[PDB]
A paper describes a structure:
MHC class I proteins, encoded by the highly polymorphic human leukocyte antigen (HLA)-A, -B and -C genes, present a snapshot of the intracellular proteome on the cell surface (immunopeptidome) where T cells surveil the peptide–MHC complexes (pMHC) for antigens derived from foreign pathogens. The typical 8–14mer peptide presented on MHC class I comprises only around 2–3% of the amino acids in the pMHC complex and is spatially confined within the adjacent α-helices of the MHC groove, thus posing major challenges for engineering peptide-specific single-chain antibody variable fragment (scFv) binders. One peptide each from CHRNA3, GFRA2, HMX1, IGFBPL1, PHOX2B and TH were selected for preclinical development.
We then performed immunopeptidomics on eight high-risk diagnostic neuroblastoma primary tumours, focusing on HLA-A*02:01 and HLA-A*24:02 allotypes. To select those peptides with the highest potential as putative immunotherapeutic targets, we prioritized peptides on the basis of pMHC binding affinity, HLA allele frequency, degree of differential expression of parent genes, relative abundance on MHC as compared to other peptides, recurrence across multiple neuroblastoma tumours and relevance to neuroblastoma biology based on the published literature. The presence of these peptides in tumours was validated by performing liquid chromatography–mass spectrometry (LC–MS/MS) on synthetic peptides, yielding complete concordance across b and y ions. Consistent with its function in orchestrating neural crest progenitor development, PHOX2B is expressed exclusively during fetal development and is completely silenced in normal tissues before birth, as are IGFBPL1, TH and CHRNA3.
Residue numbers in the entry:
A (entry chain C): 1 to 9
B (entry chain B): 2 to 100
C (entry chain A): 2 to 276
The structure:
């Protein structure tokens, strides 16, 4: 199951 | 960063003439990911070749498996031809049944 | 034994036209179970193992949404990094990301990871404590200060120690019949007369799972590395792996040499000898 949020750099 | 691919050419199963098999070209250790890989039969490009989804190792270098079904014979010669920005000319690695 | 779940992400910019190529792969131990390729027609997260097809449409809809959101993050990161490194818009560049978790043989959390690279070099990575960041250069240091202020590590830690472990367990149960089976190496030795006075012994390990394996040569019961060759472990294409190790020996002395195979699927190491 993937991360729900992937914050940008 | 530029890393030249390692190449292994091999069958999925111990090769026997006249018995269907899979011809593999495993390319690894390379960077960047843009790469051209063809499987050859007696010097000609084999058309129905599939490959794995791009993935990479802990040092960030990429690896791909290219493969096609084939039936080895005594006379047919098989090889993998790889081109990559690190290569001045395409590298051709012949299939050796013992490797 | 122990187990892991890992996601790998690659995004390659395409300056001549269009958006970056994005490829995501998901892997339980050495088994790929999902993929997304921005060049593919589905535009969906796709199954790559039978046991993940037990998941219903809410799973595929949500993972598809999330992997597309991952791809957009990588797209804007490529733009951010281009500016951080004052690079031109004419060149192609690459971001790579891996994250996931390990659990022990008791399925308890062991270790979480989240690492990021730009053009094949470390950029930023979560430390083993899952609280601080390793920034390789001053560009990554700018990201580190931004992610510290926003407490990104706390969010990733909640996932790596929580969500990740729980779903790895669920996958291990749904795929028990393969994910929890070890395939011991099928071993044999071949003999090749190089010249009149030397022969090559090649010790083969075939059709094994998982990929981790150790092949060693001994001469008279002592480890030998001189005049040996070990190939990288390689995929068979059917989910198992292959490896071989070879040693060059004086012709007629083959019997002094033994090949030793260690693998999780073996109750004890195997020893092979040419007779």
């Amino acid at each position: 199951l993937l991360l729900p949020l992937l914050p940008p750099l | 960063i530029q890393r030249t691919p390692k190449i292994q050419v091999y069958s999925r199963h111990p090769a026997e003439n006249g018995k269907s098999n899979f011809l593999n070209c495993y390319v690894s250790g390379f960077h960047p990911s843009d790469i051209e890989v063809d499987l050859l039969k007696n010097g000609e490009r084999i058309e129905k070749v599939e490959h794995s989804d791009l993935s990479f190792s802990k040092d960030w270098s990429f690896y791909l498996l290219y493969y096609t079904e084939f039936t080895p014979t005594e006379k047919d010669e098989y090889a993998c031809r790889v081109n990559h920005v690190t290569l001045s000319q395409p590298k051709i690695v012949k299939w050796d049944r013992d490797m | 034994g122990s187990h892991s779940m890992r996601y790998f992400f690659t995004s390659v910019s395409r300056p001549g036209r269009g958006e970056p190529r994005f490829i995501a792969v998901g892997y339980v131990d050495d088994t790929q179970f999902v993929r997304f390729d921005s060049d593919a027609a589905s535009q969906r997260m796709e199954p790559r193992a039978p046991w993940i097809e037990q998941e219903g449409p809410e799973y595929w809809d949500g993972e598809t949404r999330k992997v597309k959101a991952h791809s957009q993050t990588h797209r804007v990161d490529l733009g951010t990094l281009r500016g951080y490194y004052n690079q031109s818009e004419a060149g192609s560049h690459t971001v790579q990301r891996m994250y996931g978790c390990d659990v022990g043989s008791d399925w308890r959390f062991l270790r979480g990871y989240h690492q990021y690279a730009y053009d094949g070099k470390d950029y930023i990575a979560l430390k083993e404590d899952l609280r601080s960041w390793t920034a390789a250069d001053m560009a990554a240091q700018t990201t580190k200060h931004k992610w510290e202020a926003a407490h990104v590590a706390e969010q990733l830690r909640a996932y790596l120690e929580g969500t990740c472990v729980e779903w790895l367990r669920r996958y291990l149960e749904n795929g028990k019949e393969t994910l929890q089976r070890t395939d011991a190496p099928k071993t044999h030795m071949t003999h090749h007369a190089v010249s009149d006075h030397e022969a090559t012994l090649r010790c083969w390990a075939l059709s094994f799972y998982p990929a981790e394996i150790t092949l060693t040569w001994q001469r008279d019961g002592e480890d030998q590395t001189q005049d040996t060759e070990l190939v990288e472990t390689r995929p068979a294409g059917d989910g198992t792996f292959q490896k071989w190790a070879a040693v060059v020996v004086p012709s007629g002395q083959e019997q002094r040499y033994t090949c030793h195979v260690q693998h999780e699927g073996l109750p004890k190491p195997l020893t092979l000898r040419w007779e």
